[PDB]
């Protein structure tokens, strides 16, 4: 049913994602990590003990956050009408190429010009401290901040983002898709519902929808360049062991 599609996707968004825009905006208005001293201060309370370099510690914390978000995005996609009806291989393909586009889109909700939220809202790491790290760890979030700054200027809310993320996942352009025509039909319904929602929620910007279409293309390019950084770390950083779920996602992308 397309009459209740926007309400159902928004509800699945609020149900499955521990962090959203209205929650992050409340916190951003919370320990601050701005140097090596405050980083160790935060890790003493938010990380458990069972030694590696600080760049690898932030790497493992960030990749762990991605693993949980992939699980949330999987459950979110299950609540999208028609997704569970696809073949199991098609569901894998949609998530494989879609999760990181949705992750970096959703990352904008916890970012401002000065930094981003970490540790489920309990910490705030500054933009300069991330740039002050050694290469290639300092070249990771900088293009994400740049994307987030232009994306946040659109002033979308969780109701807009929920439909945006749904359109990202249900993309008939992913390589190796089987039921291309039916997934394209699913995308058409979500995109059309997103079009009407943007018309009602943002009547002051009647060209907001083509703006969001360009952000979808910006995200795919941001992800492809991000996967190149993943391979650099995988090949030239032994202490940065990569999570098996993330190994499977980036493999053959």
């Amino acid at each position: 049913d397309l009459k209740s599609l926007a309400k159902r996707i928004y509800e699945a968004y609020l149900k499955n994602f521990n962090m959203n825009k209205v929650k992050a905006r409340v916190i951003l208005s919370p320990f601050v990590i701005h140097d090596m001293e405050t980083l160790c201060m935060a890790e003493k309370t938010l990380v458990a003990k069972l030694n590696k370099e600080a760049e690898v510690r932030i790497f493992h914390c960030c990749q762990c956050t991605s693993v949980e978000t992939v699980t949330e995005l999987t459950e979110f996609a299950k609540a999208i009408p028609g997704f569970a009806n696809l073949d199991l291989n098609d569901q894998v393909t949609l998530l494989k190429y879609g999760v990181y586009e949705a992750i970096f889109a959703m990352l904008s909700s916890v970012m401002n010009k000065d930094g981003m939220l970490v540790a489920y809202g309990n910490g705030f790491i500054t933009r300069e401290f991330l740039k002050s790290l050694r290469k290639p760890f300092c070249d990771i979030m900088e293009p994400k901040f740049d994307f987030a700054m232009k994306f946040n200027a659109l002033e979308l809310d969780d109701s807009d983002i929920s439909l945006f993320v749904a359109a990202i996942i249900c993309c008939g352009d992913r390589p190796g898709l089987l039921n291309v025509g039916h997934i394209e039909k699913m995308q058409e319904g979500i995109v059309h519902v997103l079009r009407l929602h943007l018309q009602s929620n943002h009547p002051d910007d009647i060209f907001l929808f083509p703006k969001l279409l360009q952000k979808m293309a910006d995200l795919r390019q941001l992800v492809t360049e991000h996967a190149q950084l993943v391979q650099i770390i995988k090949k030239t950083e032994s202490d940065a062991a990569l999570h098996p779920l993330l190994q499977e996602i980036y493999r053959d992308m």
Binding site: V70, T74, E75, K78, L88, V92, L245, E248, I249
Partner: peptide, 10 residues
């Protein structure tokens, strides 16, 4: 069998 299939089959 892949790990992404585990999250989808659950």
């Amino acid at each position: 069998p892949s790990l992404l299939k585990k999250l989808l089959l659950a």
